[PDB]
Amino acid sequence: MKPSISVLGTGRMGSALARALLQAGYRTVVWNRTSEKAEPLAALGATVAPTVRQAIDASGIVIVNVSDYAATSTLLRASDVTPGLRGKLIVELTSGTPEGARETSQWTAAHGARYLDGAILATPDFIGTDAGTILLSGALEPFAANEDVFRALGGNVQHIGTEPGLANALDSAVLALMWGALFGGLHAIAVCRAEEIDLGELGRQWAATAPVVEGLVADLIKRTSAGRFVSDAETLSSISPHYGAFQHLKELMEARRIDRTVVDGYDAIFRRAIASGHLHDDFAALSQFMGKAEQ
Amino acid sequence: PSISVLGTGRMGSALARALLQAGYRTVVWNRTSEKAEPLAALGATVAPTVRQAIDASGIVIVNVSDYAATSTLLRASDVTPGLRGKLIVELTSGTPEGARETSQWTAAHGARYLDGAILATPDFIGTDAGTILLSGALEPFAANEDVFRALGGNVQHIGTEPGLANALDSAVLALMWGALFGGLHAIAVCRAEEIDLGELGRQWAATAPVVEGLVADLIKRTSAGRFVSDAETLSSISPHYGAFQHLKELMEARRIDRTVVDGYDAIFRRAIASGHLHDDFAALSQFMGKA
Ligand SMILES: NC(=O)c1ccc[n+]([C@@H]2O[C@H](COP(=O)([O-])OP(=O)(O)OC[C@H]3O[C@@H](n4cnc5c(N)ncnc54)[C@H](OP(=O)(O)O)[C@@H]3O)[C@@H](O)[C@H]2O)c1
Ligand SMILES: NC(=O)c1ccc[n+]([C@@H]2O[C@H](COP(=O)([O-])OP(=O)(O)OC[C@H]3O[C@@H](n4cnc5c(N)ncnc54)[C@H](OP(=O)(O)O)[C@@H]3O)[C@@H](O)[C@H]2O)c1
Ligand SMILES: [K+]
Ligand SMILES: [K+]
């Protein structure tokens, strides 16, 4: 076939989604409240639909990419547009909860629309590339039928199961890692700022040292999955040296008036693990001490 | 040159093996001497005391719990007289003031000093990727570049000022712990949403380069003062905060300790309270100071 495809939301992402569809030779129609933010996509060859309704019935698949499900829900569940959803495919690529996916599934189905709920595990620069990862959950047929449309967004766009909440559950897990790393960087930058270290140096040192962290994270997951909490020949780090080295960071942050709210959080997990006889056990032991302290 | 390693831990053992593999006469000491016996068979000499170890070799690499422990091994009246003409390489984790103090005391006993941060797990010592940052005097590094190359292909001298290594160590380890506590969270979520950790594993493999781009971008942008949104930003604060809500709610609901994420929240809210809701993620770097 080669359908017409609509994108609702011309944000930073969404704009990317749209450009990636234009670059693969799909007729792409775009709507955005604050329509001036959608003008750039006109020049790249998209048609700028004046309203949601015009957009959702100008195309046979509709990709949504706005703030949250609350905003999706006010665009698509309006009496204005709900009648037009018949036979269309809604692909909800906005960040949401698994209950949010299950609700949006049920109301789209109730208006004669097919539903795919998706988590974009990728920044704008990755949409269009063979590396671009988007996880989609929902019915299989509407995915299988349009594999060509999904390939235009990324080479690593995958269908992961029937149950439509699955994509967002996974999204929340992966985003937990992403924020850990990023708030790690925010700390790293605050330390460098305090000890008058050029961030260029931090940059070129992270380039070199990132693979070590990747090994460490991968190890955490492998070991936790296997219940290998006790120290053994294969562990690369025990809690003792982590906690020992960590002290030096706390003291530095205390001295330099850097917010400790986050690291005091780490401390509490360490101390919980050490309170059980885990001082000299693999870093993965910490995974058993993730629940709330008070009971 | 004969080379001594004090501390045959998990690391240190690695340091020792890497020296033996490059054909250095390596002597090793460890309290609880049975933990150093394995290195005998790979060709190390297990010195019964610290003193015998530090005057059996001309460079001494230290790798124990903390500077307090280094200081009780080397500043004992037993051994301090033997430190003359030696090079102490302190590769144990410590503070920058700790480096500056250990510099001054070693110099006062006629010893040369390099303070080092090992930015690598044991498996990376011996490999071209192995990264160790050394600060201290240049000559004692330059003179022994071959000894450092045996520990890693990415072993660097970064400045005269001897605290520099540990300052940088604390910054880099902040990133490392961010990621790892990120994983611990990611695992708690997976456990709650009945996701097999294998799935998390193979999804992080795929998705890690995205995070690497994001972290590298943070640093490049912060260094350049590019806090305001522009054509080149891949993420603004708004969508981060929006998606973050879904994580907080999940952890609240599943009785997962929120001490950490409430910490993130506070930084977001501080950035948003200034007109930075739709600015690059890097803007958050300006809201890292206390209350
Ligand atoms: N940025 C990334 O790298 C990335 C990656 C993965 C996931 N995501 C997800 O992708 C989505 C898009 O993020 P983004 O970076 O594109 O954000 P953004 O540039 O800040 O734009 C948000 C978009 O949502 C629209 N919107 C917001 N509130 C709305 C409302 N109440 N009613 C209608 N439309 C509304 C905006 O229209 P207006 O112009 O009128 O505000 C705009 O099109 C988010 O759900 C985010 O969680 C983003
Ligand atoms: N593991 C890593 O990947 C890694 C990363 C970078 C740097 N480091 C740093 O390297 C150092 C060692 O780490 P590790 O993994 O080897 O820790 P570890 O396996 O627990 O070993 C600690 C070593 O320090 C010795 N030690 C501790 N307190 C001592 C004292 N009071 N007197 C004498 N020796 C003492 C221990 O002696 P005993 O064995 O008899 O107890 C042992 O040899 C730490 O500063 C750590 O922060 C480690
Ligand atoms: K979604
Ligand atoms: K050190």
Numbering used by the authors:
A (entry chain A): 1 to 295
B (entry chain B): 3 to 293
Text of the article:
In recent years, the emergence of imine reductases (IREDs) has had a substantial impact on the application of enzymes in the preparation of chiral amines of pharmaceutical interest. IREDs are NAD(P)H-dependent oxidoreductases that catalyze the asymmetric reduction of prochiral imines, but in certain cases also enable the reductive amination of prochiral ketones through catalysis of both imine formation and subsequent reduction of the iminium ion intermediate. The enzyme designated IR77 by France and co-workers in a previous work has 100% sequence identity with NCBI accession sequence WP_053252429, annotated as an “NADP-binding domain” from the nitrogen-fixing bacterium Ensifer adhaerens, also known as a species of Sinorhizobium. The enzyme adopts the canonical fold now well established for IRED structures. An N-terminal Rossmann domain (residues 1–164) connects to a C-terminal helical domain (195–294) through a long alpha-helix (165–194). Two monomers closely associate in a domain swapping arrangement that serves to form two active sites per dimer, each at the interface of one N-terminal domain with the C-terminal domain of its partner.
